[PDB]
């Protein structure tokens, strides 16, 4: 009933449901419909 939004672009709601990775959420000029924007990622490359 209040988990965290750990999904890519997971729809959030300025009020409680915050991104699990603590990310800056934003919305439009209506006050509804928000999307978590990724802003971290690791440095270097992937496996191999």
Please describe what this structure looks like.
The protein is built from no helices and three strands. The protein has 48 residues and is mostly beta strands. It has one domain (1-48): Omega-AgatoxinV. A hairpin with a 6-residue loop joins strand 2 and strand 3. It starts with 10 loop residues before the first strand and ends in a 12-residue tail after the last strand. The modification D-serine (Ser) is found at residue 46. Its main location: secreted.
Task: Please tally the helical runs, counting DSSP H or I stretches of 4 or more residues.
Answer: 0
For the CA atoms, what is the radius of gyration?
Answer: 13 Å
What is the CATH topology assignment?
Omega-AgatoxinV
Question: How large a portion of the residues is in β-strands, by DSSP E?
Answer: 15-25%
Main sheet: strand order: 1-3-2
Helicity level, as a percent range? under 10%
Structural class: mainly beta
* Total discrete domains: 1
What CATH architecture do you see?
Irregular
CATH class: Few Secondary Structures
Distance between the termini: 39 Å
Question: How are helices and strands ordered from N to C?
Answer: EEE
Structure summary, number of beta strands: 3
Record the SSE blueprint:
Elements: E1 11-12, E2 25-27, E3 34-36
Antiparallel strand pairs: 1-3, 2-3
PDB class: toxin
Keywords: toxin
Assembly: monomeric
């Amino acid at each position: 009933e209040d988990n965290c939004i750990a999904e890519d672009y997971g729809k959030c709601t300025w009020g409680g449901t915050k991104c699990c990775r603590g990310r800056p959420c934003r919305c439009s000029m209506i006050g509804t419909n928000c999307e978590c924007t990724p802003r971290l990622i690791m440095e270097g490359l992937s496996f191999a």
